[PDB]
Amino acid sequence: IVEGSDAEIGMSPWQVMLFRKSPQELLCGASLISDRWVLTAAHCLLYPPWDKNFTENDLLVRIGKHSRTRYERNIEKISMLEKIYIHPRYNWRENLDRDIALMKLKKPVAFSDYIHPVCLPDRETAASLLQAGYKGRVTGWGNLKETGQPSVLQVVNLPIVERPVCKDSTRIRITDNMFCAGYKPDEGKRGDACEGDSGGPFVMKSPFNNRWYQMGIVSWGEGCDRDGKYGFYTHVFRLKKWIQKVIDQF
């Protein structure tokens, strides 16, 4: 996260770290949506242009963390993966369309003060909140700038951007399964996700029921926190029928 701040303890208890077993390294963020299911970006697991194709046994998820590098004894919980599900129409060839994946844990994780699932949006909450100018929150342990790495989980609040401005900021073909967020050059304030934040959550706190909803997944961006560029996020509600189909079937 660029130009963010240290998270408070328990501020993002759905935050998940995707962790490579060997070598031991941060791969991506992710989020907890139930005691057995973790949501992330498909390109965190599958991206042939970079020879990336992780299997279940390659990975762990670490839940309840605050410190990036410490083993947080008695606080974090480490879970093995039972199965990875990637969206069948994830477009890694062109523009990361439908950049979404689910991971089923081998065993349910115990909830605690530090471990708790986020909600997924309904149609009405999505329609109400996914509006230009409305702010969401992005969290992660990724790099602090484009060109270093944080001691603890970082957090930044960022406004959703009008779709024409998102499109006009890039040569990539944008789809309805994406939205973009960030400040404009003329708005003064700054902030963005960066390398290592992919797969983590863009959340909003509903003013109707005071619950946190995951509206986006950190997906892609051109550099980090560049003037006139924006971060792009997987549109969770638009892909929710696939999410539910996977959970209902497996």
Partner: peptide
């Protein structure tokens, strides 16, 4: 860079 995690998780 990262602190070693308990061996039980790497089996």
């Amino acid at each position: 860079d990262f602190e070693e995690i308990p061996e039980e998780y790497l089996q």
